[model samples]
Target chain A: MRGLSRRVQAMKPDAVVAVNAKALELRRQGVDLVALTAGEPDFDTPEHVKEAARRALAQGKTKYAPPAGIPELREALAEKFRRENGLSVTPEETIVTVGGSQALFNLFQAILDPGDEVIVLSPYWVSYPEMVRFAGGVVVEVETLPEEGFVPDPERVRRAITPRTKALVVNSPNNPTGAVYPKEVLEALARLAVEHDFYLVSDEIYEHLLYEGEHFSPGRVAPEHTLTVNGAAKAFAMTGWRIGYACGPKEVIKAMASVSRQSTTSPDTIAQWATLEALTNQEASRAFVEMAREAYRRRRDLLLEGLTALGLKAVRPSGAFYVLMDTSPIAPDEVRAAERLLEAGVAVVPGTDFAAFGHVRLSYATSEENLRKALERFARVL
Target chain B: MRGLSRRVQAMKPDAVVAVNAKALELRRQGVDLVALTAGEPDFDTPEHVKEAARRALAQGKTKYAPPAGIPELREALAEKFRRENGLSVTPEETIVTVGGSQALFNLFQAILDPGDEVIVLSPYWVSYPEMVRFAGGVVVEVETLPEEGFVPDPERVRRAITPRTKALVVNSPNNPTGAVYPKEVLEALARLAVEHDFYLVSDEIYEHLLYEGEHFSPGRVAPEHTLTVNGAAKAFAMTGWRIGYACGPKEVIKAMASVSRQSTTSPDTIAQWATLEALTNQEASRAFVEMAREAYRRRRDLLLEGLTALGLKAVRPSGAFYVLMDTSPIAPDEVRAAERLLEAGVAVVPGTDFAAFGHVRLSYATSEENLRKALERFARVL
Candidate 1:
């Protein structure tokens, strides 16, 4: 009771959150800093979404929703998956969570038993393996190389599969590495899950943020075997709203809901209402998504161009907002690389905890001006 | 998952949620059911609280909070615990959560390892045992009998403690059985935790719902050993807002925050800002709490008097919104009693899942008219 459970004690402190904390602490002490450590968009949540929250407030729709979510939001989620991602799902197959983070968390807790092995692609979001191990699953990493634009090799993934493997997590339009897997590759991953009789966890939270290549939901290929996780946080500039959704096989979705029933009961009711508006108001929602996507593309272009000019060896990310710069050029490891950058008034996340030992992640979610400043600071660190 | 893990498959759906879902399904089918099955107050959230959210929306503050909480909310919570409950805790010792439910879930996950024993008082909230076991802890029930009005006996709790005992859960102004423990009883429970060197998880979410007795937080007695959980859901009629706060020893609180970092991330930021208003704006917050408590008291009296006049056996609830009525008069078991009541167009939670067998839980958070209608329906069921 005085000490932590092994499960919690073993949980790695998120490197991103840790880096951001130190960055914020220095800012609080009146130091000027450019932080490329956050995973959320810098834009204000769009007006139409804010209006829906206002309507919810005025209507007083603040009551406990069903554990899975409010029915209206779930119904909307089904349509969004069908129309946007080509996943045919009924409302009953849809479950809402506090964030895409919670969706993945509940999925792991619902699916992973003790000693169950989950195949996680390396250069993954820091949360992937953290969530897996927290659910009593073993993290079996399948490395996605920088030379391959961080794309997973389906053959390598297939070879790693064992009787103990319960799931394979694939994040396309990825987090730290920002690789948008080609449609064929996604299909191959889904086919392997189908062929191997394991679950394919497709994290499509960054689907709408793609700058090149069309986003594909592998759930389209393995509908029965894929659990598609998406959320309002990234595309809609609503990270604080904390609404995420998933659709999968009925029993699995229901089991995840069961997990929610005991742990969270439900997500915030007002946020759920606002998300319903986000999904249902197609015209307005699409505008905001496009606006965000366009801005991110510009920022990504600006940041990537800056890194190239500075002679930094960073993978050119086609999707999402992060670029994994090769830390080998700056320091022996990403930790010192991050420290050198932090000392130069620029903060970036060390990829050490993401199993990305030779890289540090630079987020392009901040302003073009901040990105410019960070690039200048990078020169000094070099 | 193609099949659920042992943890989730073993997870029981909450009785309140099950009953409420059925009630909604029937309502949609034009059943005209008078449902007393919900756990939230029938009242809408307070205006000032909702306005605080409006301020957050206008200020564009919708971004991810720190995993534990926004610093302002945690600091306010430290002040709140000290001023209201006489619990001396620093800002670092406090955390904000999605709901009181998340706080409890996170607390259990923070402390319980496999086969660790957690003492729970039954008839308890259905989630207490469920949350404990989700963390792989063994549920060791310490029965609080109907004869004692469902108040926990410290002596019986003492006997339940073993070498493996990790924590003891006490929900004052209890859920189904609204028995408010006296200060001395709370002290004894706290003293037991101190002596045993185990955590005392004191759930005081219903602290402001009391009609007869003053709320006592045991953390005041066992400062180093108690985790005090409270929330805005009940007191401010903000159940959908889903904001809960807790304070305890620094390491324990930090570990609980670690659990949240992997699962939920953080509560909704707008909701956290609103809760900050609820805690800091004493006049507005207290006015809403006082109004709600008074309303619940009247509804409880009406429901109890109606049951008493009918010669139905029920315990007088001192706080919160529920009353556990003996089901023997209506049917052979609580489930059958609930069914009969549903047939009479009155929906209630069967106490079966709450380990309150032979009893049924009726919430009095609704209007007096609904209470009267429920009473009339109860007569027909009898």
Candidate 2:
């Protein structure tokens, strides 16, 4: 009998987040490490959100929730989609999940048959290709470059599609690089998807975290083909709650819901009730979106300035909590540079964790003081 | 556009649980309904368990867990299997999941190719057939009867095999019919599985909820082929916590882990940590389990007496949280009887929900007060 097996052989660990684990291990060994690899806001989930969860627990709202969602959370998601994105959706079209991570996973698993192909724009989220692989789908990358600010070229996306192509996964205000796609870019990609008869998986989890010009939803140009994945995890600093939703065409959502009904059952019940409250209550937390955006913009400028002074060219990030800098100017060792930074009391993620590269991602979701120290350390290293 | 995709049409709502939804709809109209339809314990999660969750929140263990599970939880599960069921499993072979629901769902999705056949014993947990259908497997059911205490007759098991049969799902101290298969019966079934080359999915979620003779584990006897599903939900009254685990031959568990990795990412982090506490601190909750079990045993006796008093026959259940009464003597209209029971303030689930005509399942997991009221109303309706 075979040991270890095909499943274990096929699984890949998420390398981008592996740096955080490494930092944890180092810290346990009493090695002080300033980690910059975390992708969530450093703040506590707003007091009001925590209060809602406490109130729910006290009121004994603990039981099995409906497979798709409780009615109020679904309606709240529907309202958020319509109000924020200008894309119309009904509660029937939405399905709440453990997180947007699970939402997109269910979407991919629901639609992609074995050997189906998905168009991925690299540098991508570390889990992208692995998740597609786990679903038995082929991911054909439309590669982007740091010079292009990692903006995927629409012509490349168009050329990537084939008869086996089932969906286009577009992450505007992309992870790792933090490149926000322009309206023209989104329009071209949406048009291509319409012409090719492929569904669009638009990752807008970072929509509210952008520090650039207004965000563009692919659905604004192509409603029928789009599936929107979003949640309060990023926007409201509530990652631990793991509440998010996916909204799309009724058929697609129904398919997704079936997979969900059989998989995780539903999102955590307390998270669902608290998320409903988050959508209705929390004014101060909403203001933190703008505040974080301004703070991120300033941090992006400082990192870019510090790197330029050290002769390492760094791209200016427009959104998300990261800045990926070209580390080729400093020893041609992106991974080693990251390890060296950790030894020097700072920890950052290697760009290779995201995709092919000679760069590292430094997240500014930490405090300004930490960012200042992080830049000073990077300057010394370069 | 094509509406109703093949996967969607191929799947039906979980039959035994379909009417559970109707109970919810009825309650909206202001009926003080006492639902005896739940598969969970009516007790709140033990306080120490909830305390562990609160501690995880305070300590900030909130982040992406390993795709399989947090290491400590997996180790705890491995130790639990050894101590309780005499099953020798390494932590590496155990995959913690969202619930027993997810453990079973992922197992089928990971291994069953299109057109594969999986054997089930009816009356089955309603989700089994639908889950098989969703994964594109044919479900072959072997019937167990009220006269036989719903135990699998070995001759029937030997007859249900075909070259295409890929797996067999056996829930012992079973749900609904509450039959615990005898040791010889398990050995005979294990031999047949070896001869037929089908995997065994042993759902032992109710291992600690047993009311009669000691619980038996088929997976413990047939280690090579069985995927054991167990959880904290039943034994510790933590259904809303949604943590369960699957342990099996490394090959099969590895495949299920891949399917889970793609679908749910991982189980809830706080819940996983909390469950570690549930398993490790077993001594503390031993008294609560004993008390809950004694109460359930007494409730089962009352319900059994009440049913016999009404001249209805049902197998006295040994485990899990249900009692399936034969409603054939009262003629068909179990669904209608359920509706009138609401008027009488006793809520019961219909027999059609369990894949048989003219039968009803009454759960005794609620307070004894409610159980007494429900049984009295049940006697009146009959």
The prediction achieving the highest DockQ against the true structure is: 1
lDDT of 2 at A242: 73
Q: What number of backbone clashes does candidate 1 have, counting pairs of residues 3 or more apart or in separate chains? A: 0
Residue range B68-130, candidate 2, lDDT tens digits: 789999998898888888889999889988888888888887777768888899888768888
Please tell me which predicted candidate would have the highest lDDT against the true structure: 1
| True lDDT of residue B198, candidate 2 | 69
lDDT per prediction?
0.89, 0.78
TM-score, chain B, each candidate: 0.98, 0.95
lDDT of 1 by residue, A143-225 (tens): 88877778888898889999998999999898888899999999999888888788989999999888988988999899888
lDDT of 1: 0.89
Runs in model 2 deviating more than 4 A are A1-11, A17-23, A330-348, A367-381, B1-5, B30-34, B113-117, B158-166, B191-198, B250-255, B333-354, B367-382
Q: Which ten residues in a row have the lowest lDDT in candidate 2 chain B?
A: B1-10
